[PDB]
Amino acid sequence: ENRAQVAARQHNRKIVEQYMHTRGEARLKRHLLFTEDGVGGLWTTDSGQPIAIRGREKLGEHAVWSLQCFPDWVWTDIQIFETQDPNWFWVECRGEGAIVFPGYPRGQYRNHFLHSFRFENGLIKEQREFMNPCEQFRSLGIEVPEVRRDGLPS
Amino acid sequence: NRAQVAARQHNRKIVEQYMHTRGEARLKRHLLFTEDGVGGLWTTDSGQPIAIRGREKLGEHAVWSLQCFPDWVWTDIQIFETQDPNWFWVECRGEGAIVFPGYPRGQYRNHFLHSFRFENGLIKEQREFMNPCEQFRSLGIEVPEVRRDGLPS
Numbered sequence: 001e002n003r004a005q006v007a008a009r010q011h012n013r014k015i016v017e018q019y020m021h022t023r024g025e026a027r028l029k030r031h032l033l034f035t036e037d038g039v040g041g042l043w044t045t046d047s048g049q050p051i052a053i054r055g056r057e058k059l060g061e062h063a064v065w066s067l068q069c070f071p072d073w074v075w076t077d078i079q080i081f082e083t084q085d086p087n088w089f090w091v092e093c094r095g096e097g098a099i100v101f102p103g104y105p106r107g108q109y110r111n112h113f114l115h116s117f118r119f120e121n122g123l124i125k126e127q128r129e130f131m132n133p134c135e136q137f138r139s140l141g142i143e144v145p146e147v148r149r150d151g152l153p154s
Numbered sequence: 155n156r157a158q159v160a161a162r163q164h165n166r167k168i169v170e171q172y173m174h175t176r177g178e179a180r181l182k183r184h185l186l187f188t189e190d191g192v193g194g195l196w197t198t199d200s201g202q203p204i205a206i207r208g209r210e211k212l213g214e215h216a217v218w219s220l221q222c223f224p225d226w227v228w229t230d231i232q233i234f235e236t237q238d239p240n241w242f243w244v245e246c247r248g249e250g251a252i253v254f255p256g257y258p259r260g261q262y263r264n265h266f267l268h269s270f271r272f273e274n275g276l277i278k279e280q281r282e283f284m285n286p287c288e289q290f291r292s293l294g295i296e297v298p299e300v301r302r303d304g305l306p307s
């Protein structure tokens with residue numbers, strides 16, 4: 001039981017590393033790090049509902065859009081956290097690059113990310129991205145809501 | 155290695171204590187921190203953390219916290235140990251009334267990630283990450299809609 005958990009964690013960590021270092025045209029094949037039914041996407045959206053991309057096929061299709069709209073994206077300051085679950089990892093990192101959304105001026109997008117990676121039989125079953133949507137608003141020139149702080153201790 | 159398994163199990167108990175601190179006990183949650191410990195919210199409208207530095211300042215802030223989030227509870231608490239015996243992550247939900255100065259009383263629910271870093275068996279740094287748009291909604295603040303034209307479905 002202990003030897004099986006150690007084996008899984010060691011392999012899964014390599015996948016997380018590979019995912020976090022996937023850039024450029026290699027992003028078009030990042031979906032191959034997922035199970036056939038694997039899920040990825042963005043869990044912190046302005047609507048409050050995740051943008052959940054379900055299945056390898058849809059993940060591969062999403063990658064075309066991702067490379068179009070974030071053409072030079074890099075993850076930086078990557079800190080990988082193993083957990084007591086050999087099939088569950090967290091990653092804290094930064095991300096930055098151009099944001100190219102039709103209808104908006106080209107922007108420079110920087111954000112602070114937490115990634116959740118859950119594994120099944122050596123591949124990613126569920127990837128979830130958590131960031132601050134306000135920094136994406138900023139990158140697109142969208143006015144950011146403000147919480148008035150006058151009444152708050154400072 | 156012995157210090158490590160022991161530090162981790164000790165710190166896990168602190169994380170459990172923190173996440174289950176409710177009601178008037180929130181007035182003493184700051185005692186779980188180092189004297190110079192930091193706690194705060196890392197996901198805000200400014201893009202910068204709003205942090206409270208110092209155990210005693212954290213205790214003073216608890217008064218405001220109990221006023222503005224009077225019935226707050228963390229639920230669906232998932233505690234993650236890591237390879238660093240002094241670093242924990244928690245995934246959870248949180249909800250309760252929100253009574254924010256200058257805004258109508260509301261109900262606030264969010265999804266949270268907490269980071270806990272330990273020093274000498276007390277919390278040196280607590281950081282919470284959530285989606286600020288859900289807090290905006292709870293306060294009646296309009297949230298803009300990002301158009302992702304062509305996003306595959």
Ligand SMILES: CC(C)c1cccc(C(=O)c2c(-c3ccc(O)cc3)sc3cc(O)ccc23)c1
Binds near residue numbers: 147194206218
């Ligand atoms: C002070 C930090 C640690 C904190 C703790 C709990 C809730 C909040 C919070 O809810 C927000 C603000 C705030 C600032 C100073 C205070 O003394 C009390 C609260 S300002 C703000 C702006 C946002 O966009 C989202 C949340 C908050 C902060």
